[PDB]
Amino acid sequence: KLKLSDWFNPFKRPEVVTMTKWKAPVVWEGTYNRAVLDNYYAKQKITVGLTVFAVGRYIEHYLEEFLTSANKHFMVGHPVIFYIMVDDVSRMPLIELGPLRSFKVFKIKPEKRWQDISMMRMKTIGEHIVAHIQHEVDFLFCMDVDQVFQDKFGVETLGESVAQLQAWWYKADPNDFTYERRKESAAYIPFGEGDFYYHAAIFGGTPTQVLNITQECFKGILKDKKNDIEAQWHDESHLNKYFLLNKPTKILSPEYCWDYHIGLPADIKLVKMSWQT
Numbered sequence: 001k002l003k004l005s006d007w008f009n010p011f012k013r014p015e016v017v018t019m020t021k022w023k024a025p026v027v028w029e030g031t032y033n034r035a036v037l038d039n040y041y042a043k044q045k046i047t048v049g050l051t052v053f054a055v056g057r058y059i060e061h062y063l064e065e066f067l068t069s070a071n072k073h074f075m076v077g078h079p080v081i082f083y084i085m086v087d088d089v090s091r092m093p094l095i096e097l098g099p100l101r102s103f104k105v106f107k108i109k110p111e112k113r114w115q116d117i118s119m120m121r122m123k124t125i126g127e128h129i130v131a132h133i134q135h136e137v138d139f140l141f142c143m144d145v146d147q148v149f150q151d152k153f154g155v156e157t158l159g160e161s162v163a164q165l166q167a168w169w170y171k172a173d174p175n176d177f178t179y180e181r182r183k184e185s186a187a188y189i190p191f192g193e194g195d196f197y198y199h200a201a202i203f204g205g206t207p208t209q210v211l212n213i214t215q216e217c218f219k220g221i222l223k224d225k226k227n228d229i230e231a232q233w234h235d236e237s238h239l240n241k242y243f244l245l246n247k248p249t250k251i252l253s254p255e256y257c258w259d260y261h262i263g264l265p266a267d268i269k270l271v272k273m274s275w276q277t
């Protein structure tokens with residue numbers, strides 16, 4: 001019993017793309033009513049999970065800043081569980097969590113190549129969804145550790161499957177997209193096809209949707225492997241493949257995952273989350 005016109009007003013931003021050929025909204029600053037959604041979701045006692053991985057140097061360079069900013073800005077006012085995957089828990093920074101946040105740490109086996117660390121996430125996440133995340137949360141987000149929340153990343157971001165507009169190509173055209181183009185990759189996207197180029201630093205949805213995203217992506221990662229090939233942008237190419245065959249129900253503007261090295265365009269009203277230094 002919740003409708004688009006209840007919380008979303010596109011006309012608040014006519015200059016940017018707020019809707020998709022498939023009726024899915026694209027959230028931009030000013031286009032949303034958190035207050036109504038906060039109220040709507042709190043009634044439902046909704047709870048949101050956030051998985052984040054950090055093996056090796058990334059642990060001391062980013063984990064703490066990630067957790068600290070998430071604590072302060074992610075789904076504030078709703079129960080959230082942080083799922084922390086590390087290779088060495090003794091190096092795990094323990095920050096002080098605030099109201100409605102709790103966490104769980106897990107020790108994972110550290111892959112030799114970072115590219116595989118990043119890709120093996122697809123398999124791990126899936127294992128954890130089937131094991132417990134499926135039963136602990138209503139919505140799940142999977143993020144990259146080397147990020148930082150800047151402002152409120154709220155419930156205006158929930159949906160059945162949520163993708164992130166890659167900051168450097170949302171304004172671009174599809175054939176410029178660095179999709180995988182080698183028909184030998186499961187991640188292959190013809191030169192005619194493609195809707196957008198999604199950032200893999202942030203994807204989410206319901207546990208069931210996320211389990212499907214992650215399963216399909218790992219199968220792709222494995223198919224490509226038995227074929228002695230590696231998608232150019234690894235898991236992100238597979239995700240883009242996936243999000244093409246299965247359009248996302250919600251897409252988030254680059255304002256949610258902004259690269260300040262792109263400066264500060266006029267079409268990015270307020271930055272919720274930026275890439276790390």
Ligand SMILES: O=c1ccn([C@@H]2O[C@H](COP(=O)(O)OP(=O)(O)O[C@H]3O[C@H](CO)[C@H](O)[C@H](O)[C@H]3O)[C@@H](O)[C@H]2O)c(=O)[nH]1
Pocket residue numbers: 052053054055056057058114117118143144145146199200201202233234235236237
């Ligand atoms: O030594 C490392 C490097 C990375 N990570 C993790 O791997 C992920 C990606 O990190 P990184 O490669 O530094 O980010 P980017 O290249 O900007 O990542 C983009 O590209 C990758 C594929 O190249 C993945 O798809 C990411 O999701 C996408 O945001 C993060 O969760 C990191 O914490 C580690 O745990 N240890």
Ligand SMILES: *[C@@H]1O[C@H](CO)[C@H](O)[C@H](O)[C@H]1O
Pocket residue numbers: 166168178199200201233236
């Ligand atoms: C997606 O691909 C870009 C290249 O455009 C870059 O590797 C980013 O790290 C990734 O998110």
Ligand SMILES: [Hg+2]
Pocket residue numbers: 114115
């Ligand atoms: Hg890396």
Ligand SMILES: [Mn+2]
Pocket residue numbers: 144145146147201
């Ligand atoms: Mn990253």
